[PDB]
Amino acid sequence: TQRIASHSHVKGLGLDESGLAKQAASGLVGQENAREACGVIVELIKSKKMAGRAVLLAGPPGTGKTALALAIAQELGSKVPFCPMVGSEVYSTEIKKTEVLMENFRRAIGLRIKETKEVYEGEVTELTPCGKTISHVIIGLKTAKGTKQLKLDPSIFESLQKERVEAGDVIYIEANSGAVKRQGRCDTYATEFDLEAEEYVPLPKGDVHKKKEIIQDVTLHDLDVANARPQGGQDILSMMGQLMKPKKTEITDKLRGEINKVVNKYIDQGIAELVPGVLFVDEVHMLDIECFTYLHRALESSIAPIVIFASNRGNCVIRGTEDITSPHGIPLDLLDRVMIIRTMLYTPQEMKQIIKIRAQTEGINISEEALNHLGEIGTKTTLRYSVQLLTPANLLAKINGKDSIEKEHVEEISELFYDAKSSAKILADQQDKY
Amino acid sequence: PFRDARAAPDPVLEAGPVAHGPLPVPLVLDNGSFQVRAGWACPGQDPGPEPRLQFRAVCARGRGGARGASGPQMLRSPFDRNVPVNLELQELLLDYSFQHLGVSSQGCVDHPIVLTEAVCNPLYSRQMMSELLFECYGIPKVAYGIDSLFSFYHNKPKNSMCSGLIISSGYQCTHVLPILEGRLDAKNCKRINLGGSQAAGYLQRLLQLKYPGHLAAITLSRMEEILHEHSYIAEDYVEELHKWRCPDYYENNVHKMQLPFSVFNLAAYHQLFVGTERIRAPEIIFQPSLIGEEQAGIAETLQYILDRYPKDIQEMLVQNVFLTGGNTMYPGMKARMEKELLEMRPFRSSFQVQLASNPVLDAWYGARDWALNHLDDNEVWITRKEYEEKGGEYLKEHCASNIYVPIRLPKQ
Ligand SMILES: Nc1ncnc2c1ncn2[C@@H]1O[C@H](COP(=O)(O)OP(=O)(O)OP(=O)(O)O)[C@@H](O)[C@H]1O
Ligand SMILES: Nc1ncnc2c1ncn2[C@@H]1O[C@H](COP(=O)(O)OP(=O)(O)O)[C@@H](O)[C@H]1O
C-alpha cells in the first residue's frame, strides 16, 4: 500500500456549492474565513484569463498554510501543473539565482497534446525489402490471435537491423514513435541448438495490433531545456557521449522567444492546448533581496503562472540587507503586489478533531479517554507534537497485546519522548554543561 | 479392465431384396483398409436401415495350407498403404460380402455397384480392380468414388455446389483435400503417410518397453481399447504434458488398465498404468516426429496448401473445414484443430470447423445417398461394354471422384 505522510488526510478545500466552507469536510477542519479565500483562487486559476497574479498565506507555525496550498492542488487535479519549491532551492552552484526563478516559472505552464498510440507485436514471419534501392520493407507478424502484414519505411528498417532482428524473433513496434524492441526468439525455434546464447519467449497470446487514445503532458520548461543545448542523440552506442559531462546553463532570452512563437502556431492548428498552472514558492522568506526584486518583473509578465507564497515570520530582517526589517520577512515593495490571506491558531476542540482524523487515516484505534488526553497535551505543547505520539502509542499497545490506545499508553509515551519547549527548559538549567 | 471383441455374426438373406420401381438395386461397397462396409442401396427409405457386414478386412490361412477364411474371427490383408494390391485375397473378401448379402444365381452379379477407392489410385491399380470385377463377377455397370468425398456429400447443408477442405484420417493415411465448385483440386492436394494403425503400433511398442515382464499380455486388440476408449488429443501438447508433470495431477488422471488375473498379482497381472502415453499415441498425425518420420504433419501441411491460393479464395475454402474418417473420432479433435487454425489466419478473419455426423459410417451412407440418386445418369457410370474399348484405366469425372486424365496402359 501507499505510505502515510504529513498531509495525506487532506483531500480538497471541501467548500459547499455556494462557495462557503463547511466545519469539517474533505479532511480539513475549522479555518472557514481563511479557506473560503482559496475557493476564489481556484476559480481564478480555472478561469485561465490571468497571468502573474499572486497570493500570500501568512500566519504562525502549525496553522495550516501548506495544508491549504496542497488542498488547492487537489481541487485542480492532475490536468493542471502544480510545481512546489522551497525558497532555499534558489542557491544553485551551476546557474544564477534568477535563472532558477525563471525555470520554475516556466514549469508551471503545460501543453496538453492528444495522439492515438498504435502497437504491433508478435513473431516475425518474414522480412522482404522492395528501381535500384529499398523503397519500403514488408514485414509479417504472428500471434496466437492471428497474422498481419505491415509496410515499413527504411528508417524503421534501419532500426530493426540495429536491434539485430531476424525472422522468428518476437518484436514490438510502436507505429507513432518509430520505437522498435526485440523481445527474444520465439520458442518454436528453441530446439535449433541445445546450447545457444539467446533467450526464448513464448508466442504472444495478445492481439497482433492494438489502438489507444492517449494524452501527452509537457511543460514550456521541457521545450526550453530540450532545445537549448544539442540533444545528445545517443541511444548509447556512440562513445562521443562519454566525454562531455552535462551541466545546467543560463537559457538565453532569444530561445524562449522562439519557443513561445512555435507553441502559438500549434495551439492555432488545434494540435495542442494550453494549461496555465500554479507555482507554489513555499518558505518564501528564505529568498534574497536580489530575488525578491526580480519577482517585481516576473509577476508583471503577461505569460506568468499564478504564484502562491507562504511565510511564518514576524517582523524579521530581510536576507541580504543586513539591516532592514519588514513584515513576514518580505520587502514592502513586493508585499504591495500580493493579496494576503491570514491563517489562525486552533482552539482545543479543533485539535481534537484533527487528532481523530489523523488517527483514522494512520490506521489506529483510539479510546475516548485517551483522545481527551492527547487533546490536553496538544494545548500544553503544539498540534504538530500531539499528532506525532499516535504511532508510538499504538506500537506499545501492540507490544502489550492490545488493539486500541488507552490512557497509560499515551501517558508512557509522553515520559519517553520530549517536546522542544520542555527540552529547552532542561537546557536553561544544565546551562554550563553543553 | 479390458474386454474381448465379438466375432461370427449371422448375416444371411434371400436371393435379392428387390423393392418397387427399378429392379437393379445397386450394392454400396466401402472397400476400407481397416474394415469393409457393404450393403444394398434399399431405396425409398430416408434413414439407411441396415449397413450390414461391419467386418475387419483381414483373412486367415495358416500352416495347414489347404483352406482360407474371411469373416470376423497368422493373418493377411489385401492392401498396401490404402491401395488394394492382392488378387485372390480380394476375391475371397468380395465373395464373403456377396454370399452373406444374397445373390441371384447365374454366372454373374446382376446388380450395378458403387465402390470406394484411394484419393489418387495408380492407373495399374484401377485397371486391376476393374478387371477383377468385370471379368470374374460380370457386373453390368460400376462407379468409383472417394470415401471422404462421399462423407462430405452426405454432411453438406444442401444438395448443391460447394467448396471446403476435407480432413480425412483412416488406417494408414491422412489426407487434406481442397475442393472448389464441387471439384477436387487434386493438382495441389496432399497426404501424410501416417494413421491410426501406426498409433496403435507405437502405443504397443511403448508398453512392451514399459513392462518387459509380460510382452504376451499386450496385443493389438487390447491396444485398440485404450486407443478408442481412453486416449485424447491435446489442445496444445507441450502444455498438456506440462500439467501431467506434477504427481497430484498424475494420480488423479492416469488410467488403471487391469489385466485379467490367474505380492498383489500386479508384478505380472499388472494394472498397466497409462499416463503420458494416452496423449503420445493420438498426437502422431500432428507431430510425426514422435516417430522417426520427417513430414509436415496435419498442421504445417494445411498452412502449406492454404498459402498456394489467392487471398480471397482462401477465405472462401476455409469457410468449410470438415473432419471425417477413423482418427477424427478422438475426443478434443475439433478444439485442437480450431485452435491450431486460429494462429494461421488474418487477425480478425472467420473460419468454421464441422465434424462429420458419424465419422466412420458417413463414407458408406454418402455412397448410398449418391447411388440412390444417380440411378439413371448413364454418363456417370462405367458400363460393362465400355471396359471392352477403354482398358480399365478409365473414369467418368462425377463429383466425389478422383480426377481423370487421358492415358493408356500397354498390355497383351
Ligand atoms: N485545518 C486543518 N485541517 C486538517 N489538518 C490540518 C489543518 N491545519 C493544519 N493541518 C495539519 O497539521 C500540520 C500543519 O502543517 P502546516 O500547514 O501548518 O505547516 P505550516 O507551519 O503552516 O507551514 P510549513 O509547511 O512551512 O511548516 C499538517 O500535518 C497538516 O496536514
Ligand atoms: N472410436 C474410435 N476412436 C479412435 N480411433 C478409432 C475409432 N474407431 C476407429 N478408429 C481408428 O480408425 C481407423 C480406421 O478408420 P477407417 O475409416 O475404417 O479406415 P479406411 O477408410 O482407411 O479403411 C483405425 O486405425 C482405428 O484405430
Short mmCIF file of C-alpha atoms and ligand atoms in Angstrom, two decimals, chain B residues 30-37 57 79 82 116 147-148 169-173 175 195-200 224 227-229 231 324-331 359-361 363, ligand 2:
data_model
loop_
_atom_site.label_atom_id
_atom_site.label_comp_id
_atom_site.label_asym_id
_atom_site.label_seq_id
_atom_site.Cartn_x
_atom_site.Cartn_y
_atom_site.Cartn_z
CA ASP B 30 -16.96 -49.14 -48.90
CA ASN B 31 -13.77 -51.09 -49.56
CA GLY B 32 -11.92 -49.98 -46.48
CA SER B 33 -8.36 -50.86 -45.49
CA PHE B 34 -9.18 -51.44 -41.81
CA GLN B 35 -12.61 -52.90 -42.40
CA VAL B 36 -15.13 -53.35 -45.26
CA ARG B 37 -18.68 -51.93 -45.03
CA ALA B 57 -10.59 -56.51 -43.76
CA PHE B 79 -3.89 -53.66 -49.10
CA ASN B 82 -4.72 -48.00 -48.54
CA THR B 116 -14.67 -46.60 -52.74
CA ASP B 147 -14.74 -42.32 -49.08
CA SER B 148 -14.12 -38.84 -47.74
CA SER B 169 -7.65 -39.94 -41.42
CA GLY B 170 -8.06 -43.72 -41.91
CA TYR B 171 -5.98 -46.79 -41.21
CA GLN B 172 -2.64 -45.96 -42.89
CA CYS B 173 -3.10 -42.40 -44.28
CA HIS B 175 -5.26 -36.51 -46.41
CA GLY B 195 -2.73 -43.04 -39.47
CA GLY B 196 -4.47 -44.99 -36.67
CA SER B 197 -2.62 -48.24 -37.43
CA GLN B 198 0.69 -46.52 -36.68
CA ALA B 199 -0.65 -45.01 -33.46
CA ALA B 200 -1.64 -48.41 -32.15
CA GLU B 224 -7.44 -50.85 -29.69
CA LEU B 227 -6.76 -46.02 -28.08
CA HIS B 228 -10.56 -45.89 -28.68
CA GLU B 229 -11.92 -45.53 -25.11
CA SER B 231 -6.99 -41.66 -25.32
CA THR B 324 -14.12 -37.23 -41.28
CA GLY B 325 -12.86 -40.83 -41.05
CA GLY B 326 -11.09 -43.04 -38.46
CA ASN B 327 -8.77 -40.90 -36.27
CA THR B 328 -11.08 -37.86 -36.15
CA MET B 329 -13.13 -39.87 -33.56
CA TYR B 330 -10.74 -38.85 -30.74
CA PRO B 331 -12.31 -36.53 -28.11
CA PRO B 359 -17.13 -40.15 -38.79
CA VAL B 360 -16.74 -43.85 -39.63
CA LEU B 361 -20.09 -44.70 -41.34
CA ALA B 363 -18.47 -42.62 -46.13
N1 LIG C 2 -13.84 -44.71 -31.92
C1 LIG C 2 -12.60 -44.60 -32.38
N2 LIG C 2 -11.70 -43.85 -31.70
C2 LIG C 2 -10.45 -43.79 -32.19
N3 LIG C 2 -9.91 -44.33 -33.28
C3 LIG C 2 -10.84 -45.04 -33.92
C4 LIG C 2 -12.17 -45.21 -33.55
N4 LIG C 2 -12.86 -46.03 -34.42
C5 LIG C 2 -11.94 -46.29 -35.32
N5 LIG C 2 -10.69 -45.74 -35.07
C6 LIG C 2 -9.49 -45.80 -35.90
O1 LIG C 2 -9.96 -45.70 -37.23
C7 LIG C 2 -9.07 -46.32 -38.19
C8 LIG C 2 -9.85 -46.92 -39.36
O2 LIG C 2 -10.76 -45.99 -40.00
P1 LIG C 2 -11.41 -46.29 -41.45
O3 LIG C 2 -12.20 -45.08 -41.85
O4 LIG C 2 -12.20 -47.53 -41.44
O5 LIG C 2 -10.13 -46.51 -42.38
P2 LIG C 2 -10.08 -46.78 -44.00
O6 LIG C 2 -11.22 -45.99 -44.76
O7 LIG C 2 -8.69 -46.35 -44.43
O8 LIG C 2 -10.20 -48.28 -44.00
C9 LIG C 2 -8.31 -47.33 -37.31
O9 LIG C 2 -6.93 -47.11 -37.30
C10 LIG C 2 -8.77 -47.14 -35.86
O10 LIG C 2 -7.73 -47.16 -34.92
#
